[PDB]
A paper describes a structure:
The bacterial flagellar motor is a huge bidirectional rotary nanomachine that drives rotation of the flagellum for bacterial motility. The cytoplasmic C ring of the flagellar motor functions as the switch complex for the rotational direction switching from counterclockwise to clockwise. The basal body is made up of the LP ring, MS ring, C ring, rod and export apparatus. Here, we present two high-resolution cryo-electron microscopy structures of the C ring-containing flagellar basal body–hook complex from Salmonella Typhimurium, which are in the default counterclockwise state and in a constitutively active CheY mutant-induced clockwise state, respectively.
To obtain the C ring-containing basal body–hook complex in the CW state, we constructed the constitutively active double mutant D13K/Y106W of CheY (hereafter referred to as CheY**), which can mimic CheY-P to tightly bind to the C ring and lock the rotational direction of the motor in the CW state. The density maps of the LP ring, MS ring, rod, hook, and export apparatus in the CW state were locally reconstructed to the higher resolutions ranging from 2.8 Å to 3.8 Å. Although the structures of the LP ring, MS ring, rod, hook, and export apparatus in the CW state are highly similar to those of these components in the CCW state, the protomers of the C ring in the CW state notably undergo inclination and compaction, suggesting that the binding of CheY** induces significant conformational changes of the C ring for rotational switching. In the intact C ring-containing basal body–hook complexes, there is one more peptide loop L3, which consists of the residues G310–P322 of FliF and is also extended from the β-collar region of the MS ring, bound in a hydrophobic groove that is formed by the α2–α3 linking loop of FliE6 with the D0 and DC domains of FlgC1 and FlgC6 on the surface of the rod.
Numbering used by the authors:
A (entry chain D): 1 to 89
B (entry chain U): 3 to 54, 83 to 136
C (entry chain Q): 3 to 62, 78 to 136
D (entry chain P): 32 to 104
E (entry chain O), H (entry chain N), I (entry chain M): 31 to 104
F (entry chain L): 33 to 104
G (entry chain K): 65 to 104
J (entry chain E): 4 to 256
Amino acid sequence: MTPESVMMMGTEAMKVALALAAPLLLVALITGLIISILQAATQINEMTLSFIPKIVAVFIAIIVAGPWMLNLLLDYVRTLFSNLPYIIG
Amino acid sequence: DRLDAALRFQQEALNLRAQRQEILAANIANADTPGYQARDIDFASELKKVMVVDLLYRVPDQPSLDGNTVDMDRERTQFADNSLKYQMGLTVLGSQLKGMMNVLQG
Amino acid sequence: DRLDAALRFQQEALNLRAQRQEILAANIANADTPGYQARDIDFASELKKVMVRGREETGGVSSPAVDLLYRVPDQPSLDGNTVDMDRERTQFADNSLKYQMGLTVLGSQLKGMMNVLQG
Amino acid sequence: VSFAGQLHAALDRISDRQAAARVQAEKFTLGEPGIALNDVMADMQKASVSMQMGIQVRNKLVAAYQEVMSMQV
Amino acid sequence: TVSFAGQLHAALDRISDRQAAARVQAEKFTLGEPGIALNDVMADMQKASVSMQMGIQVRNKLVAAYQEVMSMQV
Amino acid sequence: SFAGQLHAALDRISDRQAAARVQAEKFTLGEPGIALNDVMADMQKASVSMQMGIQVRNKLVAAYQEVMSMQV
Amino acid sequence: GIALNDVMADMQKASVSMQMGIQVRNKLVAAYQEVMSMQV
Amino acid sequence: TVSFAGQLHAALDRISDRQAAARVQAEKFTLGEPGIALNDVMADMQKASVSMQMGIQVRNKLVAAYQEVMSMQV
Amino acid sequence: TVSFAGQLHAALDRISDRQAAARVQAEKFTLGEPGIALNDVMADMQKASVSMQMGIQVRNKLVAAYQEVMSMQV
Amino acid sequence: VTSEQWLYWLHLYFWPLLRVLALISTAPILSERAIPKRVKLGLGIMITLVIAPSLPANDTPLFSIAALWLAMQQILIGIALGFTMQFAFAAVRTAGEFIGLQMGLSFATFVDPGSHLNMPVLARIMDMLAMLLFLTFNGHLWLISLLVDTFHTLPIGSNPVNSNAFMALARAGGLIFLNGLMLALPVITLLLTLNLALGLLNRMAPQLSIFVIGFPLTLTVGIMLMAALMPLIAPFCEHLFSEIFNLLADIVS
Amino acid sequence: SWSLSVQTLVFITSLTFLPAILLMMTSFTRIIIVFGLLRNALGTPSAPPNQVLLGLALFLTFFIMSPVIDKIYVDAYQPFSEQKISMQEALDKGAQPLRAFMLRQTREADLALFARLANSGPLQGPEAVPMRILLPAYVTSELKTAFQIGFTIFIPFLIIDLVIASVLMALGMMMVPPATIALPFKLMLFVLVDGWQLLMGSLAQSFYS
Amino acid sequence: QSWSLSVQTLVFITSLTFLPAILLMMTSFTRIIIVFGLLRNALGTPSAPPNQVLLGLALFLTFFIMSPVIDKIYVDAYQPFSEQKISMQEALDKGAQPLRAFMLRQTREADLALFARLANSGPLQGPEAVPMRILLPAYVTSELKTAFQIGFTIFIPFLIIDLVIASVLMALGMMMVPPATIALPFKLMLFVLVDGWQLLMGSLAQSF
Amino acid sequence: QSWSLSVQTLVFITSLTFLPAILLMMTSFTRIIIVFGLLRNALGTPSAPPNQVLLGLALFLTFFIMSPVIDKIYVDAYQPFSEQKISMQEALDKGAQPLRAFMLRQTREADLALFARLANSGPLQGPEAVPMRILLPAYVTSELKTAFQIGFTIFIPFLIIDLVIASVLMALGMMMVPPATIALPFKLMLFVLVDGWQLLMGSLAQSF
Amino acid sequence: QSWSLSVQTLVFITSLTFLPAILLMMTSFTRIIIVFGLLRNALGTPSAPPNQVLLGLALFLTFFIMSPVIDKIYVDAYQPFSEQKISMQEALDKGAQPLRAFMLRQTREADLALFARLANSGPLQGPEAVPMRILLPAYVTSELKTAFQIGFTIFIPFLIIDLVIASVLMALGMMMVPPATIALPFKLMLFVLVDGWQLLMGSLAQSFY
Amino acid sequence: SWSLSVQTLVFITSLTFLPAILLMMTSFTRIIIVFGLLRNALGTPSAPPNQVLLGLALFLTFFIMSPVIDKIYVDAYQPFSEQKISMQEALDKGAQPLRAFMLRQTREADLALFARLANSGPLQGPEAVPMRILLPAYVTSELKTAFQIGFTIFIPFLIIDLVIASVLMALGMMMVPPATIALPFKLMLFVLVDGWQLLMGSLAQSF
């Protein structure tokens, strides 16, 4: 009820969002950086060949860590809906 | 039912008026029977009793030779009065029902 | 103000009809009282008077500020009242119909207004 | 004092008038002396008129409430 | 444990038994059975009519309220 | 033009209403030469004209709202 | 006291004025919501 | 195999037969055919009117319900 | 080639013709014409009223259908 | 007897109802479409029932241009109060949308302005957070109290009015921008530095950077930055509400 | 007591205000606001059709207001039907359990504000609060509670859209709408975590707590 | 014991007011209409088939699905009531049985358990002890959940097409094109080459 | 057997109530309306022709297409009824046949089989005896499928134009130039030059 | 032969409902608003002037365009109606002819031929004998085609500006600069200096002649 | 003076056209278009909500109409009570200030075009321009004025965007999008100079 509880609500929610999005974004960033440094080493420059492995890497990311995200988000939503009638004002 | 309690008094008065009307007409019809006693009911007491019949003999006025105590004038006046009061009771009961109706109509 | 002014003539005429019928009923009630002059009012003059200056009362026992005029008797009577029953019942019926006419006109105007407002 | 108070007062007045007329009618039907049929019938007439007035006031009041609740905010 | 459906059933029963009682009284009075009075027959019929008008008005109010509630948008 | 025709129609309807009201007012005072049936017929004609005006206004307002709600 | 003639007439006048107020406010509110439902 | 259109057709036809029977009975009574009583004629006419009013009310309720069902935003 | 405008014009003409015939008969009866009876005048007026009411209801249904069809989002 | 003067009650209960309902239809949270219309109308009716008997009743007829002027006055007061309150949520929405646009969340607006493709999801997040905070600080009760209080300052009866006062509300349009800049500032600046850092990477071997490495890094950095910045809005939320409230108090009079 | 005609008139008139009682004195407002907000959240403004949600809200309100209705029936309707309590006293007796139910769920701040706006004297205990103060205080408290519940409801459905947009933006697909992708995932979430049982139980507890 | 004919007429004509409510809450109309709306959202165009066509088609589908239940009601309740062999109340009680079975067969256990918890129900026992006022909201909740389960998996192929087209377009280089604009004709192609409408009706019918 | 006059007018008004449903689900209005909406979406102009204009065009096209069916109904069914030659029941039965034939001409056998198998209908010999309750949903489904086919096919030339302009812009290095702004005027030019409106209406009419 | 007053009132009020349909399918309005719907797209601001401003401007322009037709209808048909020298049927027959001529002069022959063939009409001797059922949809089709022609032609100078600005931006190596935002103010410049609105309305009015 | 019921009908009917009066007769279109163009300038098409922009334009319109409202009050509101002039002579008298304002804000070319569109040859004087010719001409003039003000607003933001892109290109960056960098600088320039208050002051001065 108190504004401290509200702002905590937003923080924990958006940290959950950060945890959900961090693996995919970080995998894409690492793949892009690796392809870019390889291009710099080989002196190859086409703006389209960096887009190819990124999709494959990010799609594999759901294969490997997808169940973890799905279990984390469901637990968050379940706990939020269960604690809903105790943060009422 | 509450509807009965509102209309109980007028219904009982109307029924008692009809019964006393029948008794008075029986007195008129049996005017010529020798040895017939003129019977009547006390309207107020019986109305109390029903709201909360017994027949009372009429006090004779003139002594006849055949034992008939029915007097024409007295019972004719009572008959006319009972008819008037029956009409009044019908009017009052109809007014109460019509009021209960116009309360509902809409 | 505008709506009050538009509906004021018929409303005042209907009130004056009511008061005139009260007077006529008083005349009918006193029809057998010895020594009672029948009373009546001039509807048009009193209506214009109430129109220009608002309604007023003698007290408020209360009564209107209307002028109770005497009716001219038709034929003499020993008891000394001038309530002629034919005149009383003709004025009663005429006032009845005119009051119903006022009710009809006022109700028509008020519907004629709800028709506009309703939507 | 208030509008609800005024409506309650009007309802109480109308009911009291109706009950008085009914009680006088029952007293006349009872046979008790002094009660005239003229007064009974006139009081029943007045009670009926008062009931009809109350019914009309209720009808309008309900119509006005329905009109107000129909307003779009 | 109150029941609105049970209360409606009880009210409908009250109306229906009142109507049936008046009808049976008229039945016996037409058949000529002694003990039945015409004024009682008429009074019971009018009471049944008043009860049915009660029921009709309550039905109208309930249906109007339900329709106005269900015509609302969330 | 169109506003002029609307103004003329409104003026005719109001003249109807005023004539009916004046005739009824004169008849209320007891003035001779005015009959009850004529008063009632004029009142009903004025009511009919006013209802026609109301209906025309409703149709025109609905048409304007429907036109102005289009997605360009 | 006040008679049915006056009671009914003022009762009707009040009903008419209340209906007029309701309709005028509804027109004003509809115009305001049409203005605010704009797209700039 | 229950078709609602079939039941509506059956009810409509039954109303029609009641109306036609009442009309023919009144027709025959007017032509002075012995064996027809006025009270039965009026009673059957009133029954036909009751049946037609019941059909009207059922149609009104069905049409209203169809319009409320058919106007929802999908 | 059947056209709906032609059918609507024909129906309107039929309604107008019935109304005009009833009005003419009533006017002639008021003027003291011998070969016209009051019952026929009233029955013809009632039939014209019924026909015009049917026309009004058909117009209302047609307008409702048109306003429903033209309110689509295509 | 049996008077029940209807015009007096109508004139006593009408104009306060007009002002209360005008505030209701525009005041934040009380004007959200999720509330059924009848609930709003009943709340206005009950508030007027509580308030009106204490006020002096007006006698101007409903069938006069004075009634129209009164109705216009009540509508103006109500909408002014509600809108001045709404300005704070407008500012919060602006700050959130700008943080989100510097996230690169909706890049299609820079190439197709207003092309039916925009999702200010951060703006919505902080808008609903601001609504929750406003509910917590009981701002709506205050709004209702001030709606009542503006009578003593400005009675129902037609009163003369001023000018630059309207400008003030219009000039409040600056606050939406001015306060929005500060909220962002605590994050956009660092994001700016991040973009500057990306520029340093592009000053190396040409191409092979930006649109491939910049977007995910800046998205994650914006996310965690403003996730850490979330505790900061609440003091700024109270600051915004206080600014709107005392501006309203000063200018309405 | 009143005449039977007056009692029938009052009963028929009072039957009119049933929607007002349902909306302003009952648990209906919070549930309907929460349902509308949730429907706004999932991105399907016409999904459970208004009638379905209205029926569910009516059944929920009937299940929630059961003890209050039972207390009213046992204390007011039963004595009134048995001709033990007059018609003008059954209303007063039955208005007390509803008043208590409205009080418990209301809030001090609203009560203080509406006690100040009426210029009423000090209210040392809750037993001195009239209905003219409790009604709008209860209404405002219910509105605020419903909006709080809905606004904490809204957060996950916006979180999903945020992460969807960020993931789409990582790969450079800047012209893909995020709402169209997020809607199936929001539906999947609301299916998985017992979308309705948890919400139903949370609302019911929110009343009984 | 039987109700009077006036009471029967009053109840019968009053019950017709709940016909839309019965059709929506108690029958299969809700699930079909929700699935159709979700499919319209999934097609890429929000209002391609007018709401009227979808509503009529959903009504026909609901009638065809519920025809066995309607036949059972007619055999059990309507026919013996119309022949004046059973009373109105007993006819309603008998006719509530097949509809209760239909509602139970598609009811989630958790929904029924929760709504029995909220209604203070204690020793329930046989599946034939659940009252109508408890069974109905549980059925509605289960129908909403099932409709959402169907919709979110109806969404899948169109998301696949959208993602494939966007990925191909951006990887090829044309990153300034709107992928949805090019994708919509392909969504229509997929829907018409699979016979999406016929298969969707088959799946919706076989869901019961 | 002939319905009394009051029953006849009750039936007539109740049937007039169902007019939009008949127009949408029995005539060619739905397919034309769907194709028009898809075409409007295809030009990149979501609100250029107002909905009322397209609705009126679809209504007129439907009237022209259904003129032979209406003529058959008039000649075979309505005309004898208006001359009191036949009753209303047999007139309606005779008028059903031409409309039924028209709807059967434009339905797909697979959808008819689906709805027959779903409704548990017994084997039906030939097209002569197929209930309207079976034919109507099948015809609606077939119309939906055909409309989607036509719209998807129509979507092709604008896709060609968009792709060619996007490629021309991209091969010039113009990386941040959106192709919609350049494509919309050329889409309008393409639709104007081929006499698009009359050609598309003629194609829709010819397909019926 | 004249219709009764009740039938005349019924027909008049019924025909009052077709006012938007008549305006769209029979007057100039369809060509105007559609062009506006495209012009706001050419300027790069879909918001543009608000929708209601454009609609009302189109309405005023339509009234000015149809002033001669309205005057001819008022003179030939409605004036005898008001002065009682004509019936409602004859007035409806006579007043449509100038509007039919106005519709025919802007109707392409190909569309008219298409709708004839589609109605299986017999040999029409001359323009004067063309049925309204054939003239209305053909006029709407030709109207749409003409509006699209005008809109595409309007789309030209803004395309010129966009191409020039994009070429200038790319020739300087400023490849990462979106040219839409830069070229929008120059489109506004072009519309201001040349007096785009007045020129466009004059061109539309002259086009209808 | 005609009937009261007809007066009520006309008043409620004229109440419907209130958005038309606000848009076509007052200046509301100018401020709303200026706000839309300014929002398009900063690069954020949803930063202030459309509701807030509409309300700000409404308040600005109310102030800038306050002199005309005062003239209406003097010429129409007051004498309608003293009944020196009423009904016809006054509604037109009260509308006269609107005519003066719209003549002031209307260009001559639009009026000339709309006159030759109505074949009104003998329109010689400039205070007897009919409403049919005055209204659309005034709307077109308002559109032109709003577009000019929008371009003037556009100039500094376009300059800032160009400068940011030029410095990015000169510094060696060829891939960094200049919009992301230039957006916060656009905002800090807009706030620091206090763009909003000067913009409203100029709009009020713009009449």
